[PDB]
């Protein structure tokens, strides 16, 4: 019976709705979501919402949904996004669905200026993005100004030929054509190989303060923590790889990163609300757990996947060549229907 609560879950490309009750856990809602869309590499994902206080977090899967301050509005809003990024997408993103999702989430972040991207890289990124949307460049169907309708570059990157958007749709095409002979999938994965190397890719930024009260930025990623200055979020002032951490903890707004190396100092910072601290150590344990995972041998589930992937691919290199030949003929056959009709137009 229990009062039902309306829930909207937006994925990168989809739009979902569900129903939950007071005793429903985050994990239970999560599994309904992944079940639906058909995702198996769940370990990189999570459900994100906004704080009553205005922050952005990930629903805890072990506790009840309505038990962790949600906006208290209806329906409830959650975004199904990538929460942990791998160290090598080429090696760790096994299935397409998983690739497409990272791809869309990252592109959105590259296009909205959430992730810094130098102009030349943005242009190159756009080409791969068009290559997977439009396919090989066709000098016949792709009538100049074909790109004129979609977001290809960050606003920052634009404006440099502003009111001259044609120059961009021009520089981009130069590369689009340079990609003839590459499937949507490879383009996507190549986009990611490029993005995956940007200085602020896959970095969770937290606003903090120095022991004296200096506004800094903490960052958590698959490699450790970093402290950035208030005017720069691209370059770390101090680093903290896992191997350089022997113990981290907090005490209501006070964080402590115990060095593992030649008894260096002891970095400490202070966060406004208490949750922020709880969250930071959560991301860390998460990222570190995954950091370790990649180091140990592949599990068993993975081995099955990586396998039903290579074979799944091969089954699409043949199908890709079967639909190719049964039309590479259709040409030689219609180049005849012509050769003849033409010769007998007398």
From Swiss-Prot:
GO terms for cellular component: adherens junction; apical part of cell; apical plasma membrane; basolateral plasma membrane; blood microparticle; cell periphery; cell surface; cytoplasm. It comes from Homo sapiens. The chain holds residues 2 to 346 of 577 of the full protein. Its main location: membrane. In resting T-cells, part of a PAG1-NHERF1-MSN complex which is disrupted upon TCR activation. Interacts with NHERF1. Interacts with PPP1R16B. Interacts with SELPLG and SYK; these interactions mediate the activation of SYK by SELPLG. Interacts with PDPN (via cytoplasmic domain); this interaction activates RHOA and promotes epithelial-mesenchymal transition. Interacts with SPN/CD43 cytoplasmic tail. Interacts with CD44. Interacts with ICAM2. Interacts with ICAM3 (via C-terminus). Interacts with PDZD8. Interacts with F-actin. Interacts with CD46. Interacts with PTPN6. It is found in: Cell membrane; Cytoplasm, Cytoskeleton; Apical cell membrane; Cell projection, Microvillus membrane. This is Moesin. The modification N6-acetyllysine is found at residues 79, 139, 165. GO terms for biological process: cellular response to testosterone stimulus; establishment of endothelial barrier; establishment of epithelial cell apical/basal polarity; gland morphogenesis; immunological synapse formation; leukocyte cell-cell adhesion; leukocyte migration; membrane to membrane docking.
């Amino acid at each position: 019976m229990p009062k039902t609560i309306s829930v909207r879950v937006t994925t990168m490309d989809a739009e979902l709705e569900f129903a939950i009750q007071p005793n429903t856990t985050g994990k239970q809602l999560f599994d309904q979501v992944v079940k639906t869309i058909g995702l198996r590499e769940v370990w990189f994902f999570g459900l994100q919402y906004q704080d009553t206080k205005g922050f952005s977090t990930w629903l805890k899967l072990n506790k009840k949904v309505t038990a962790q301050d949600v906006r208290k509005e209806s329906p409830l809003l959650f975004k199904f996004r990538a929460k942990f990024y791998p160290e090598d997408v080429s090696e760790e993103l096994i299935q397409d669905i998983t690739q497409r999702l990272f791809f869309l989430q990252v592109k959105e972040g590259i296009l909205n200026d959430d992730i810094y991207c130098p102009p030349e890289t943005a242009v190159l990124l756009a080409s791969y993005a068009v290559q997977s949307k439009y396919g090989d460049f066709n000098k016949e169907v792709h009538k100049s100004g074909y790109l004129a309708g979609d977001k290809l570059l960050p606003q920052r990157v634009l404006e440099q030929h502003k009111l001259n958007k044609d120059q961009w749709e021009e520089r981009i095409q130069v590369w689009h054509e340079e990609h003839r002979g590459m499937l949507r999938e490879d383009a996507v994965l190549e986009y990611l190989k490029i993005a995956q190397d940007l200085e602020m890719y896959g970095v969770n930024y937290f606003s903090i303060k120095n022991k004296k009260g200096s506004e800094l930025w903490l960052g958590v990623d698959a490699l450790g923590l970093n402290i950035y200055e208030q005017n720069d979020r691209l370059t770390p002032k101090i680093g903290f790889p896992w191997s350089e951490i022997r113990n981290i903890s907090f005490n209501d707004k006070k964080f402590v990163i115990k060095p593992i190396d030649k008894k260096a100092p002891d970095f400490v910072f202070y966060a406004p609300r208490l949750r922020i601290n709880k969250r930071i150590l959560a991301l860390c344990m998460g990222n570190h757990e995954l950091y370790m995972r990649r180091r140990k041998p592949d599990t068993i589930e993975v081995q099955q996947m990586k396998a039903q992937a290579r074979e799944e691919k091969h089954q699409k290199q043949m199908e890709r060549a079967m639909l190719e030949n049964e039309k590479k003929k259709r040409e030689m056959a219609e180049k005849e229907k012509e050769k003849i009709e033409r010769e007998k137009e007398e």
